[PDB]
Amino acid sequence: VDLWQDATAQAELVRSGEISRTELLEATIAHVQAVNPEINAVIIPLFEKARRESELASGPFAGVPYLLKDLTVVSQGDINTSSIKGMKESGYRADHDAYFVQRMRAAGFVLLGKTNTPEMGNQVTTEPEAWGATRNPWNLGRSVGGSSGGSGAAVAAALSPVAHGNDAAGAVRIPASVCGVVGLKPTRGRISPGPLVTDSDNVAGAAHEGLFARSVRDIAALLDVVSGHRPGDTFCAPTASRPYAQGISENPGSLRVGVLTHNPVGDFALDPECAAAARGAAAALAALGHDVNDAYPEALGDRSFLKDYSTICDVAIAREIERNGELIGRPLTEDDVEWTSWEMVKRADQVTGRAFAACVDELRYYAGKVERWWEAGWDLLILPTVTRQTPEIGELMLAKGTDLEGRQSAFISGSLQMLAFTVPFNVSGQPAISLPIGMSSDGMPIGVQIVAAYGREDLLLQVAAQLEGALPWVARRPQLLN
Ligand SMILES: O=C1CCCCCNC(=O)CCCCCN1
Numbered sequence: 001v002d003l004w005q006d007a008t009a010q011a012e013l014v015r016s017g018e019i020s021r022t023e024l025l026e027a028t029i030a031h032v033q034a035v036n037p038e039i040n041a042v043i044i045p046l047f048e049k050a051r052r053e054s055e056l057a058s059g060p061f062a063g064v065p066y067l068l069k070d071l072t073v074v075s076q077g078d079i080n081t082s083s084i085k086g087m088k089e090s091g092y093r094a095d096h097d098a099y100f101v102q103r104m105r106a107a108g109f110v111l112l113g114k115t116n117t118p119e120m121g122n123q124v125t126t127e128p129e130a131w132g133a134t135r136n137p138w139n140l141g142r143s144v145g146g147s148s149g150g151s152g153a154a155v156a157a158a159l160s161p162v163a164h165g166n167d168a169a170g171a172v173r174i175p176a177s178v179c180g181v182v183g184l185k186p187t188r189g190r191i192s193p194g195p196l197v198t199d200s201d202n203v204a205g206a207a208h209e210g211l212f213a214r215s216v217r218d219i220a221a222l223l224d225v226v227s228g229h230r231p232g233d234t235f236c237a238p239t240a241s242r243p244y245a246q247g248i249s250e251n252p253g254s255l256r257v258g259v260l261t262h263n264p265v266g267d268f269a270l271d272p273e274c275a276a277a278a279r280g281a282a283a284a285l286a287a288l289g290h291d292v293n294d295a296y297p298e299a300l301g302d303r304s305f306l307k308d309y310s311t312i313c314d315v316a317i318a319r320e321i322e323r324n325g326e327l328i329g330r331p332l333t334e335d336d337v338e339w340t341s342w343e344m345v346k347r348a349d350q351v352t353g354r355a356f357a358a359c360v361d362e363l364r365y366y367a368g369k370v371e372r373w374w375e376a377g378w379d380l381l382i383l384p385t386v387t388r389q390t391p392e393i394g395e396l397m398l399a400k401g402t403d404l405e406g407r408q409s410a411f412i413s414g415s416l417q418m419l420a421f422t423v424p425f426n427v428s429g430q431p432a433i434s435l436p437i438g439m440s441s442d443g444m445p446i447g448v449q450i451v452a453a454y455g456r457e458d459l460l461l462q463v464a465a466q467l468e469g470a471l472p473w474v475a476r477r478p479q480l481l482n
Pocket residue numbers: 120121122123124146147148166167168169170171172199203207313316317408410
């Protein structure tokens with residue numbers, strides 16, 4: 001069984017009869033057992049559940065395995081740590097299935113296990129104290145990005161053809177860029193993170209559930225599976241007229257495309273190789289007939305909003321520490337979490353109701369400034385997913401002694417460059433996808449990001465499909481896989 005086939009092809013091999021559900025599953029489990037030890041991607045294997053669901057699985061993807069991030073969404077009866085030391089020791093297990101999980105099972109997917117993440121998803125690298133660092137299949141001494149680093153690495157190493165993750169500042173797109181896979185943060189309100197309400201209304205709407213895959217068609221199919229308004233969902237996205245798996249092949253025509261190949265904020269230089277990858281993709285779109293120009297939302301030249309976002313994040317983590325404490329029946333202390341997280345507890349205590357409300361308003365205002373660019377006639381923005389070369393393991397984790405006065409550790413220097421080009425779209429809520437189109441001169445994947453207007457995943461997946469055909473990446477594989 002060639003596990004390098006995408007989810008759609010793997011589903012067909014089972015439907016066709018070529019392969020059995022047990023063969024694919026067992027072939028996948030064996031692969032996981034052999035390769036995962038080297039990357040520490042899957043932290044909680046669920047082979048037994050995967051085996052039970054496989055026998056009962058039914059639908060367009062019956063028998064196809066997938067991985068779930070151990071954050072936000074939960075699976076009934078399974079361990080849930082959110083990479084919190086105090087929670088891992090408690091042996092806590094969730095009592096229900098998140099809507100996302102139910103939707104996947106009904107589609108025929110089998111829950112193979114959970115993937116690693118930094119504590120409560122508070123970093124753009126995946127090196128939690130609780131589970132250890134997740135390493136890059138392309139280079140074991142390198143980070144896999146974060147916070148959905150385990151899912152990104154898992155898919156890159158073929159531990160599964162698709163996986164789940166979430167994105168509040170680029171947590172799906174970043175790991176995708178760094179690990180050479182496709183990562184989509186859909187329009188705000190596209191995918192339900194319920195029935196639970198976590199992270200203070202999902203970080204005031206900035207946190208989106210996202211998807212990982214190696215093909216654009218797999219992403220389109222996944223959207224058809226997990227999208228839609230569910231009871232209690234705060235946000236909602238515009239409805240598509242046709243299923244995404246069908247519209248992906250439609251010709252969008254010549255679109256107004258703007259390309260960004262420098263850091264508009266001017267507080268650091270965009271890595272030349274990252275810029276060249278985006279430029280190359282822009283050239284391919286021009287060759288395809290689009291109206292490509294050097295242009296971008298002027299709002300991107302401002303990152304003042306990040307200060308306001310950080311304040312909201314302080315409150316969200318603080319209350320999340322509280323929520324997890326309740327799950328086990330006892331308050332969590334400075335000894336149950338990482339020092340970076342505990343520091344936010346104190347900061348949260350100094351945030352007033354009026355201040356919190358003002359910060360949220362600042363996000364809405366910024367979102368408006370950003371979206372006005374599309375309002376003015378532009379259809380898509382092309383830009384690098386990340387702005388720097390991939391960091392080495394350990395590089396982004398700051399020593400407890402370190403003094404990062406006032407702001408999120410992920411929003412400073414080395415970490416800032418990982419999320420500077422992704423976070424603006426968590427604020428605007430626009431659909432944004434990272435495609436594994438580039439490679440660094442030293443063999444590390446470089447993602448190219450495409451952003452469409454609010455709710456226009458249809459156009460986004462259409463152009464992504466064109467780029468997939470113009471600059472195919474399927475031929476490239478991490479050294480971990482020989
Ligand atoms: O999007 C991410 C990674 C960036 C972390 C930014 C700080 N915000 C939070 O920790 C809120 C929790 C969102 C987790 C998603 N991770």
